[PDB]
Amino acid sequence: MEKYHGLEKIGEGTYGVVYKAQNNYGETFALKKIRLEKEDEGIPSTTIREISILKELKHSNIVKLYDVIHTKKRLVLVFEHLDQDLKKLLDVCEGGLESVTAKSFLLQLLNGIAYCHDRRVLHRDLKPQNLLINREGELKIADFGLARAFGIVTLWYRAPDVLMGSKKYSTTIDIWSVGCIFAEMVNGTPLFPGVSEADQLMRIFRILGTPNSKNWPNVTELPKYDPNFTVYEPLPWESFLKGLDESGIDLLSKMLKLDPNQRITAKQALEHAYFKE
């Protein structure tokens, strides 16, 4: 427990409970105590190695990992502390964020993602709960790389190929989640708040169109593709987006391509005219 005190529970995060604490030097940290489904199983050395490599992620928009504390069927990660998450901010912003704010958060999110992607680190569970925000307006991403170590459930940010059973390593999956978060920041409200896997696909297809072999070649190869999906035409973007100019809609349309091979990358998104304005 590397001598920390004043453990204050922030709440229950994705892989465990998070506490604000101070060290014996009086500096502030966030401690994540990893929840172990099978207490007896123990954490293998390969897992400890996969988490510790994440200390090498040093970027102004990635939450810094300082330490990995492993003692006796107990696993604690020491991170920098941030004061809020984007979910808690969006909860008190009626209608969503001002255009200048959403653009500033999207830029920072894509920068942090570009950095990890260049190192072949995936997130795969991006959501407003893991986009942390300080009082200076700086956005930093939490939990990048942890899905590789660790694998009720929010489906709202999951790409349709993942929902249909794709399992391949791919950077495209995080870009879908960014597009869903972008729309949430401008609309106020989540874009595809599904209640199950089947309903999550339906919410997506109702807005963006049911996929087929012509608009997504090779879609029929996904394990849970269903040749009976209801057929929905795509809606015009202007009709379910608000407070976004032409460039913003354009950028958003590129992140929400159903076919992952046509989806914009993080670095491509950072070059888009939306950010020159």
Ligand SMILES: CC(C)[C@H](CO)Nc1nc(Nc2ccc(C(=O)O)c(Cl)c2)c2ncn(C(C)C)c2n1
């Ligand atoms: C749900 C919890 C566990 C949380 C939000 O994602 N995780 C969570 N919240 C943090 N900060 C706060 C502090 C206070 C509040 C508040 O409620 O006022 C919130 Cl939401 C976040 C935080 N800082 C570093 N980390 C690392 C551990 C990465 C954090 N993880």
